[PDB]
Amino acid sequence: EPYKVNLSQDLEHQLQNIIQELNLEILPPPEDPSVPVALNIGKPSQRQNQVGVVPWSPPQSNWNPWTSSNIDEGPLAFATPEQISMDLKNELMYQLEQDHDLQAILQERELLPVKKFESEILEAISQNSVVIIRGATGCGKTTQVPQFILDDFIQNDRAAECNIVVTQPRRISAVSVAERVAFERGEEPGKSCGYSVRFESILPRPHASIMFCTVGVLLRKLEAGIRGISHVIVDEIHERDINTDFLLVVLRDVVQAYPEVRIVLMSATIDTSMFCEYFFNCPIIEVYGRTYPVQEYFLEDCIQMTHFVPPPDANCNLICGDEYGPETRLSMSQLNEKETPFELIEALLKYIETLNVPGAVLVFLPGWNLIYTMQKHLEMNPHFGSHRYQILPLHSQIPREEQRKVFDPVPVGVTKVILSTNIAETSITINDVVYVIDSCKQKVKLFTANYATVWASKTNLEQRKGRAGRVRPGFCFHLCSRARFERLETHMTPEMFRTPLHEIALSIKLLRLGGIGQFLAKAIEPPPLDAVIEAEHTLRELDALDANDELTPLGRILAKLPIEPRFGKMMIMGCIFYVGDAICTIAAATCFPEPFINEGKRLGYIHRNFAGNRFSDHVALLSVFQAWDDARMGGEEAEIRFCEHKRLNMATLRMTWEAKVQLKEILINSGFPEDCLLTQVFTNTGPDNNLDVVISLLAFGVYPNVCYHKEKRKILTTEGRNALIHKSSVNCPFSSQDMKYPSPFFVFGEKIRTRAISAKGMTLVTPLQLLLFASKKVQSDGQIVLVDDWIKLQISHEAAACITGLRAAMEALVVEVTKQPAIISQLDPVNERMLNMIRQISRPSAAGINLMIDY
Ligand SMILES: Nc1ncnc2c1ncn2[C@@H]1O[C@H](COP(=O)(O)OP(=O)(O)O)[C@@H](O)[C@H]1O
Ligand SMILES: [Mg+2]
Known part of the structure; x- marks a missing residue:
C-alpha cells in the first residue's frame, strides 16, 4: 500500500513557482489513470577518437620520474650521469663493507631460490623487450628481481640510467614490499625504494630507484606518458587483476612503438602461454627451489x-x-x-x-x-x-x-x-x-x-x-x-569477465587510446559485450560521456578522481552546494573500513550517540570526524585517548582524513574555489540545512541502494526482495525492536550477501529526497506515484512533477559548472533559487518530519 506524503501548501506553491521560473512545465495528469505518465525527463558534439599509444622515454639525469618534474634547486641539480653513477656506487660499496648487519641480510638474500637464476634473468631482460619470469610462490621474484636489475646498473656504472616501476594488484602489497626491499638494502622507504598507492606515498630518490605502486596510480599518471622509466615490472599477473589485464593492453602497444623499454611480467606456476603469445612469444625464465610433498x-x-x-x-x-x-x-x-x-x-x-x-x-x-x-x-x-x-x-x-x-x-x-x-x-x-x-x-x-x-x-x-x-x-x-x-x-574467471568497466572506460578516454569497445577488444581476454554496453550506458547517464562516447569536462574530472565516478559527481554537487568538505569526507570514507571498534557485533552505547537523531550511519561517521578533529588539537596523546576511549580505530581516521585532503586537492586544481570546500561545523540533533543537503547528495551518490522498512530488522530492496538491517547499523534495534522511524525510506552503502542479505551504512531519507535524487523512473496516475516500479507514494502529481523537474535542472547546472567550475561563486539568481528550493526540499520539515522531539 502507498505511503502518504504531507506537503504544506506553501511548499506546494514554491515548487510550482520555481519550475515556472526555470521555464519548465508540469506534465498534466493522465486522462485515463490506467495509462500513467513519466514525470522523469531527459536533458553535445566534439571530435572522434582513433587509436593512440602512450608515449615512452628512458631515464634522464635532470628528471624526477616519481614527481614528474625537473631538478633545478637540488644538490644533484646540474650533475652529470657519471658523477651520479659513481657516487651511488661508492655509497653502496662503502655501506656493504662496513654494515655487518646488512652483510648478514645480504647473505640471507643470496640463499633464496631465485638467486641461482640471477645471470639468466638479467641477460634475458637485457636482450628482449618483454620477459616473463615464472616460478613458485616463495622463490623471491618480487623482492629480488627489481634489486638484481638495479644493482646490475649500479655495479656496471650505469646507475643513472635505471628507474624501475613495479606494479602490484593490492595496496598492502606495494607498501609491504617497498618496506621489505628497503630493509634488504639497509634503508628506509624513500631512498632507493618507494611506494605510491591511492592517498599515500613515500617517493624514492630521483635516480637509480624502484617505485612499487598499484596499477590505478600508474594508470592515472599515464596521461603525461611513461616518462624517465627503463623498466616496467608487472607483478603477480596470474591473479588476473582487471587493472593489470588492462595495463597489459597499454604496455603491448608501448613495446611495439618503443622497443627500448623493458617490460618484465612476473608470474606464479601457471600456464603463461596466454601472456607469452600476447607479447610476441617472449622468453620465459623458469625459477624453482626445493619442494616437499x-x-x-x-x-x-x-x-x-x-x-x-x-x-x-x-x-x-x-x-x-x-x-x-x-x-x-x-x-x-x-x-x-x-x-x-x-x-x-x-x-x-x-x-x-x-x-x-x-x-x-x-x-x-x-x-x-x-x-x-x-x-x-x-x-x-x-x-x-x-x-x-x-x-x-x-x-x-x-x-x-x-x-x-x-x-x-x-x-x-x-x-x-x-x-x-x-x-x-x-x-x-x-x-x-x-x-x-x-x-x-x-x-x-x-x-x-x-x-x-x-x-x-x-x-x-x-x-x-x-x-x-x-x-x-x-x-x-x-x-x-x-x-x-x-x-x-x-x-577462477578473470575479473575482466565479471567486473564493471566504468573506471577503465574513463581511463581509456582520458588517455586518448580510442573507442572503449575497440580498445577492450584487444585485451588478452576481452570482457563480455554487455559489460561494455553497461559501462558506456552508465557514463552517458552521468554526462561523463556525450552521445558520441566522447569525454566531457565532467567526465574528465571524474577520471582524475580516484573514486567511483558516481561519488565523483556527488562531490561536484557538494561543491556547488558549498558542502564540499562533508561530501569529500563521505567519499573518502568509502575506501576504508568502519572507524568503529565493534567488539560485540551489536552496536555500542557510545557509537549510537554519534548518530544523533538523523538515523544515519553516514551522519555518525561525519560526527566522529568532527570530534576526532577537535580532539586532535591537543596533540598525539589526546588523539590516542579520544580514540580508545570512544572505541575508534585511529589509523582509519587518519587514512580517511588524508584521502579527503587529496580529493579536495584534485577539486581545487580542477577550478573549484576554496570557499566551497572549507570544513563546516554542524549538529546531529538540531536543525542544520547543510547536513540536510549532505543527506540529499548522499542519496544521489549511493543510488540505486534504496530500501523500505517493514518492522524489526526486515526491509525491502529495489526489486521487491527482502533483506535485513546489518547489526553494525545505528538504525539496527536491540533484541527489543522498538525503533519507530519517522520515515521508512533509507539509502545504504553496501549489500552484504552472507547466508541472508544485509544492508550496511543506512541513512534515513524523506519521500522528497527519494523523488529528487534516489530514483530514476517516476510514474503518476494523478493520485499515486510509482517510483522505480516498486515504491508507491500517495503524493500530489504537481509536486512530484516539480521535484523531478528540479533533479533535471540540477543535472543541467552540473554540466554548466563543469565547463568553468569557478562560476559557483557567481551563479545567476534563478539557479540560486533552484539550489535554495533543493535546500528546502532536503529539510525533514518539508515532508512534515520532526527529529528534535522523540517522535
Ligand atoms: N616482510 C617480510 N618479512 C619476512 N620475510 C619476508 C618478507 N617479505 C618477503 N619475505 C621472504 O622472502 C621470500 C619470498 O620473497 P618474495 O619476493 O615475496 O617471493 P615471490 O617470488 O613469491 O614473489 C620468502 O622466504 C619470504 O618469507
Ligand atoms: Mg611476488
Whole structure:
C-alpha cells in the first residue's frame, strides 16, 4: 500500500513557482489513470577518437620520474650521469663493507631460490623487450628481481640510467614490499625504494630507484606518458587483476612503438602461454627451489581423523564415499556448505599437535568477518591462550605493524596460527609453514545492478596446498567435500569477465587510446559485450560521456578522481552546494573500513550517540570526524585517548582524513574555489540545512541502494526482495525492536550477501529526497506515484512533477559548472533559487518530519 506524503501548501506553491521560473512545465495528469505518465525527463558534439599509444622515454639525469618534474634547486641539480653513477656506487660499496648487519641480510638474500637464476634473468631482460619470469610462490621474484636489475646498473656504472616501476594488484602489497626491499638494502622507504598507492606515498630518490605502486596510480599518471622509466615490472599477473589485464593492453602497444623499454611480467606456476603469445612469444625464465610433498585432505577426512560431530549446485555434503565410516558420513551431512565449520578447525588444530612435528598452521578464510569470528572462537578457550598458541590475523585492513608479526619467529613450544585471506596464496610467503587449513572459498565482488562468498578454483586449492611444502613434508586440510571438489571450476574467471568497466572506460578516454569497445577488444581476454554496453550506458547517464562516447569536462574530472565516478559527481554537487568538505569526507570514507571498534557485533552505547537523531550511519561517521578533529588539537596523546576511549580505530581516521585532503586537492586544481570546500561545523540533533543537503547528495551518490522498512530488522530492496538491517547499523534495534522511524525510506552503502542479505551504512531519507535524487523512473496516475516500479507514494502529481523537474535542472547546472567550475561563486539568481528550493526540499520539515522531539 502507498505511503502518504504531507506537503504544506506553501511548499506546494514554491515548487510550482520555481519550475515556472526555470521555464519548465508540469506534465498534466493522465486522462485515463490506467495509462500513467513519466514525470522523469531527459536533458553535445566534439571530435572522434582513433587509436593512440602512450608515449615512452628512458631515464634522464635532470628528471624526477616519481614527481614528474625537473631538478633545478637540488644538490644533484646540474650533475652529470657519471658523477651520479659513481657516487651511488661508492655509497653502496662503502655501506656493504662496513654494515655487518646488512652483510648478514645480504647473505640471507643470496640463499633464496631465485638467486641461482640471477645471470639468466638479467641477460634475458637485457636482450628482449618483454620477459616473463615464472616460478613458485616463495622463490623471491618480487623482492629480488627489481634489486638484481638495479644493482646490475649500479655495479656496471650505469646507475643513472635505471628507474624501475613495479606494479602490484593490492595496496598492502606495494607498501609491504617497498618496506621489505628497503630493509634488504639497509634503508628506509624513500631512498632507493618507494611506494605510491591511492592517498599515500613515500617517493624514492630521483635516480637509480624502484617505485612499487598499484596499477590505478600508474594508470592515472599515464596521461603525461611513461616518462624517465627503463623498466616496467608487472607483478603477480596470474591473479588476473582487471587493472593489470588492462595495463597489459597499454604496455603491448608501448613495446611495439618503443622497443627500448623493458617490460618484465612476473608470474606464479601457471600456464603463461596466454601472456607469452600476447607479447610476441617472449622468453620465459623458469625459477624453482626445493619442494616437499603435501598430503591433502577434504571435509570427509577432517571428520574421520578428529572424530568430529557438529552441533544440532546441489549440496555436496550428502555425497560421501563408501570407504568412509557411517558417523563420518552422517556428521558431514549435518554441516551446511555455505558456512565454514569453525568447530572443525579447532579440532584440526588439536589433531595437528598430536602429530608432534613443530610448525605454523596457515588458515585460509574469506574476509575479515570470518577471521575475527575464528579468532574469538579460539581465544575464548584456555587451550589457545598465549602459552601454547600465537594466533595472528592477516588481511589488507590491519596495522602494518601486525602484518610483520606473521613473519616473526615464536617462543619454542608455541604453534603459530595465521588466519589469512588469499593474500597468503601467491602474494606473500610466511615462514615455517607445515600445515594449511583451507576453507576453499573466495570473497569476490559480483555486482549486477556487493560482496559474496563463493567457491575457489582447483588452481586456488592447488596453490594453497603448496604453501605447506617449503620447509618439510606438509599437510593441507580442505574444508570442502570430495563431491564439491569435482564440481569446482578449474580456474577462477578473470575479473575482466565479471567486473564493471566504468573506471577503465574513463581511463581509456582520458588517455586518448580510442573507442572503449575497440580498445577492450584487444585485451588478452576481452570482457563480455554487455559489460561494455553497461559501462558506456552508465557514463552517458552521468554526462561523463556525450552521445558520441566522447569525454566531457565532467567526465574528465571524474577520471582524475580516484573514486567511483558516481561519488565523483556527488562531490561536484557538494561543491556547488558549498558542502564540499562533508561530501569529500563521505567519499573518502568509502575506501576504508568502519572507524568503529565493534567488539560485540551489536552496536555500542557510545557509537549510537554519534548518530544523533538523523538515523544515519553516514551522519555518525561525519560526527566522529568532527570530534576526532577537535580532539586532535591537543596533540598525539589526546588523539590516542579520544580514540580508545570512544572505541575508534585511529589509523582509519587518519587514512580517511588524508584521502579527503587529496580529493579536495584534485577539486581545487580542477577550478573549484576554496570557499566551497572549507570544513563546516554542524549538529546531529538540531536543525542544520547543510547536513540536510549532505543527506540529499548522499542519496544521489549511493543510488540505486534504496530500501523500505517493514518492522524489526526486515526491509525491502529495489526489486521487491527482502533483506535485513546489518547489526553494525545505528538504525539496527536491540533484541527489543522498538525503533519507530519517522520515515521508512533509507539509502545504504553496501549489500552484504552472507547466508541472508544485509544492508550496511543506512541513512534515513524523506519521500522528497527519494523523488529528487534516489530514483530514476517516476510514474503518476494523478493520485499515486510509482517510483522505480516498486515504491508507491500517495503524493500530489504537481509536486512530484516539480521535484523531478528540479533533479533535471540540477543535472543541467552540473554540466554548466563543469565547463568553468569557478562560476559557483557567481551563479545567476534563478539557479540560486533552484539550489535554495533543493535546500528546502532536503529539510525533514518539508515532508512534515520532526527529529528534535522523540517522535
Ligand atoms: N616482510 C617480510 N618479512 C619476512 N620475510 C619476508 C618478507 N617479505 C618477503 N619475505 C621472504 O622472502 C621470500 C619470498 O620473497 P618474495 O619476493 O615475496 O617471493 P615471490 O617470488 O613469491 O614473489 C620468502 O622466504 C619470504 O618469507
Ligand atoms: Mg611476488
